[PDB]
């Protein structure tokens, strides 16, 4: 959770030239893998 | 195979067991009971071998992106630069190259005046590394070199090799 | 400027300027004229595969380049070796090429080394080592590099039926792009500021084997008669 | 062997290339002949690029059992290739009438066949050897 | 299914210069090999 | 039959500069070797 | 695997234990 | 050119009365974030390299 906190803070002030969803951030502890927000949005449609 | 079987059957015998390779047939010599034993061993070691079809699947998906943009400044009359290494090429080599590319004139009075065209090799060396938009806006001898690029890459690869093998046998592919 | 493309606008414009006829004047009133070399322009154009078209507008020279490379390949080679049961046979159609190590003679080509043994009827067991090679130049390497695709396995095939030893199915899509970015986003004019390089590769390999058991002389004569 | 000995680096060594047939028959007490056969057809190719000359070599060495006077096929290869290639602008090369102006097409079709057959003949009497020698003479 | 989802998303926004059926995508889980859409269409005719 | 299908499709849109009978195509499963169409035509005459 | 098992079983036997690799089957000979 | 090649930043020469004051200032802000996780599936008591 220390590193995850660091990475969430990296995502709040994000890459200036790129979308803030592109910065790698650990999943919440114990939740394994998550699809990207856009990809996740796409999956629900199909 | 007789060679494998003869080796195995040596212990069961302990009688002579000899493997004839070309016919793939093995010659047993023993009394009656030991013969009836080794024929029941051979009967159960002679079974058919099932064979597996191994189909691997390899998936390699790469993706990449980047955006590199920044503005540099320079004045070569009194050399003063705002210069960066992140960018493809730095304002120094670009302005130097542009000056070397200009046509130079060499005058000797008394009234000889010669004119000569300059080489582009320094400018060519400066531009060769540009990937992107490098645009020189010259304003009041201050030349601002803007550079910006977005490199978007992707890769998608599936290769699956399948090797068909006899059970317990090994295969290279 | 873009690296995806065959040649970059820098070397092209530099080459075109070097190709122009230069004049060198010394007044007092000597004026000399001389034609420039094409070697830089020739070095820039040598790598172009495609359409590279320079549209010069108001000293801004826009170099468009576009190409579609469509390739295909189709190959069937089947080597058959006729063997005594339990005997081994080598088959090679190819070449011996020397390779540093000193040096040594290594065989490359279509080669099939098989060691059958026959279930007392029908099914044949095969210890098989099968290679398809060829010689490729070394870039860069100390010695020539063999393109080699081989599979060596052990299979059990019915008498007259085909069985698939091996295969590969490979697919690739490599897309690449470059843009300003912001101007390349516009739908209508974006294609002016973008350089896109797309590629799709595909490959298939199957290796099948059909044994046939020859027992009578009339069978061998029947096969030899049709292959003859 | 009908061919040539050519030297090859290793030092150097004499290696034979050409048409060569090395056979070791044994005869079933009548008719069928068993053959341990090693058969090669080679020739010398220049080395490009390589440390030494490269032999084009096609050989098969097997063991077959052939009837007395009948032919039997040891080996073979049947190879077929079609390599097509193309380049175009693309868009202009798509037009049916004027597309051929902007396209470069390179097509190739290769084909190859190899069969290797063997016919033994058993010579027992002297009149048989004289009968064969008389016709080959 | 995670990778298959990624690849389907690659097929929705496809190769800009090439047909979107040329991007490799895993078959649905357990279905082995499928012919291309055009090739499949051809096969049914013959 | 998968490869044979691919090759038949290669024969439907063939070599543009060469005759479409020159593209190698697997024989139908189990049928071994076939003469070319022209060669086959020649054979029947003799 | 027969090769691993035959080695292990040597001591238990102490009779002959022979590993047939290709079938991955081991041949035991001993009293009842 | 050899003197300017090493400049990362703002190097500005203000010439006043033959005394040329060269100001230089830069702020280099860097960051890196990396996650790679490799998973190898193994038989118990067996070893695997990846």
Swiss-Prot record, chain G:
It is found in: Cell outer membrane. Belongs to the bacterial secretin family. GSP D subfamily. Forms a cylindrical channel with 15 subunits; unlike E.coli no 16-subunit channels are seen. The closed pentadeacameric channels are 195 Angstroms long and 145 Angstroms in diameter. Each subunit turns in a clock-wise manner around the channel. The N0, N1, N2 and N3 domains are periplasmic, while the secretin and S domains form a channel that is partially inserted in the outer membrane. The cap gate extends out on the extracellular side of the channel partially closing the channel. The secretin domain forms a double beta-barrel structure; the outer barrel has an outer diameter of about 110 Angstroms while the inner barrel forms the central gate with a small pore in the closed state. Involved in a type II secretion system (T2SS, formerly general secretion pathway, GSP) for the export of proteins. Required for secretion of cholera toxin through the outer membrane. This subunit forms the outer membrane channel. This is Secretin GspD. The gene is epsD.
């Amino acid at each position: 959770n220390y590193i995850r906190a660091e990475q969430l803070f990296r995502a709040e002030k994000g890459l200036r030239l790129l979308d803030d969803a592109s910065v790698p951030v650990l999943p919440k502890f114990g939740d394994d893998r998550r699809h990207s927000p856009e990809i996740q949005a796409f999956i629900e449609q199909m | 195979k007789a060679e494998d079987l003869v080796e195995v059957l040596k212990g069961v015998s302990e009688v002579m067991i000899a493997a004839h390779a070309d016919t793939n047939s093995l010659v047993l010599t023993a009394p009656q009971d030991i013969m009836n034993a080794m024929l029941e061993v051979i009967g159960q070691l002679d079974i058919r071998r099932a064979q597996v079809l191994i189909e691997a699947l390899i998936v390699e998906m790469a993706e990449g992106d980047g955006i590199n943009l920044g503005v540099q400044w320079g004045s070569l009359e009194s050399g003063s630069v705002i210069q960066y290494g992140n960018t493809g090429a730095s304002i120094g080599n670009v302005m130097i190259g542009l000056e070397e590319a200009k046509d130079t004139t060499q005058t000797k009075a008394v009234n000889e005046t010669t004119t000569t065209k300059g080489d582009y090799t320094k400018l060519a060396s400066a531009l060769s590394s540009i990937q992107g938009a490098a645009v020189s806006i010259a304003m009041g001898d201050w030349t601002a070199l803007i550079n910006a690029v977005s490199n978007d890459s992707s890769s998608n690869i599936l290769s699956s090799p399948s090797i068909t093998v006899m059970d317990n046998g090994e295969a290279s592919f | 400027q873009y690296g995806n493309t065959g040649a970059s606008i820098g070397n092209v414009m530099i080459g075109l300027e070097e190709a122009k006829d230069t004049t060198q004047t010394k007044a007092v009133n000597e004026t000399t004229t001389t034609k420039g070399d094409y070697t830089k322009l020739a070095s820039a154009l040598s790598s172009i595969q495609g359409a590279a078209v320079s549209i010069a507008m108001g000293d801004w020279t826009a170099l468009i380049n576009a190409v579609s490379n469509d390739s295909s390949s189709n190959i069937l080679s089947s080597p058959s070796i006729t063997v005594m049961d339990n005997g081994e046979a080598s088959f090679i159609v190819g070449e011996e090429v020397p390779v540093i190590t000193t040096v040594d003679r290594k065989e490359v080509g279509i080669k099939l080394k098989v060691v059958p043994q026959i279930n007392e009827g029908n099914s044949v067991q095969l210890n098989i080592e099968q290679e398809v090679s060829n010689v490729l130049g070394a870039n860069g390497a100390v010695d020539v590099r063999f393109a080699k695709r081989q599979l060596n396995t052990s299979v059990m095939v019915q008498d007259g039926q085909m069985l698939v030893l091996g295969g590969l199915i490979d697919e690739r899509a490599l897309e690449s792009e470059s843009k300003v970015p912001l101007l390349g986003d516009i739908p209508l004019l974006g294609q002016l500021f973008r350089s896109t390089s797309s590629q799709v590769e595909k490959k298939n390999l199957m290796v099948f084997i059909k044994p046939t058991i020859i027992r009578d002389g009339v069978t061998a004569d029947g096969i030899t008669q049709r292959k003859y």
